[PDB]
Design a protein around this ligand. Sequence first.
Ligand SMILES: Nc1nc2c(ncn2[C@@H]2O[C@H](COP(=O)(O)OP(=O)(O)O)[C@@H](O)[C@H]2O)c(=O)[nH]1
Ligand SMILES: *S(=O)(=O)c1cccc(S(=O)(=O)Nc2ccncc2)c1
Ligand SMILES: [Mg+2]
Length: 168
Amino acid sequence: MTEYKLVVVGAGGVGKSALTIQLIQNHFVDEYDPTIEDSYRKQVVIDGETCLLDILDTAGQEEYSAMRDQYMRTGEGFLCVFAINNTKSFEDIHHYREQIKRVKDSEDVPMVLVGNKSDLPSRTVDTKQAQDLARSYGIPFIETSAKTRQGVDDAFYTLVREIRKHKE
Ligand SMILES: Nc1nc2c(ncn2[C@@H]2O[C@H](COP(=O)(O)OP(=O)(O)O)[C@@H](O)[C@H]2O)c(=O)[nH]1
Ligand SMILES: *S(=O)(=O)c1cccc(S(=O)(=O)Nc2ccncc2)c1
Ligand SMILES: [Mg+2]
C-alpha cells in the first residue's frame, strides 16, 4: 500500500503531539513531554485506498539537528500548526514555512496551515487572518481541536491528498 511521510511543525505548546496522538491513537493527551520528538505510524483508508501514514511530531530542541534535517528532506508534506488562542504561535508560522521551503529547496511543497485549540473560547487569532496567511502561502487552512477531534482527520488527510496529487 502507498506510504506517506508527514511532518508536524510549529511552536511548542500548539498541540502537535496532541493532534498526532489523537490521529494515531484516538486519545487526547493533555500531558505529553514537550521535549519528545517521535515518529508515529497508522494504517488508514483515504478515498477508498489503504494508506500508511508515517508522522513526525517535532520537539523544539531538535529543530536544527542533523537527524531532523534527514526527516525534513524526506518528509513529503507538512502541517504548520499554531494555536488559535496564542498569537505568538501564529506569528511564528512564517519561520516554519521558511524552513520547509529551504530544506525541500522547493516552492511546490504539500502543506496545510492548522489552527489548533478551536475548542477554546479565548481566541486571539481570527480565521480571516489565518485564511489570508494560508492564501499567501498557496495552501489550505484547517481548524482543529485535538481535544474534540474537530478537523483532525481533515487536516492530515487533506495533506495526504496534496501529496497524492503532487506525486500522481
Ligand atoms: N484545549 C485544547 N488543548 C489542547 C489542544 N491541543 C493541545 N492542547 C493542550 O496544549 C498543551 C500542549 O499540547 P502539546 O500537544 O504538548 O503541544 P506540542 O508542544 O505542540 O506538542 C497540552 O496541555 C495539550 O493538552 C486542543 O486542541 N485543545
Ligand atoms: S526514523 O527512525 O528514521 C523513522 C521512523 C519511522 C518512519 C520513518 S520514515 O517513514 O522512513 N521517514 C519519515 C520522514 C518524515 N516524516 C515521517 C517519517 C523514519
Ligand atoms: Mg509535543
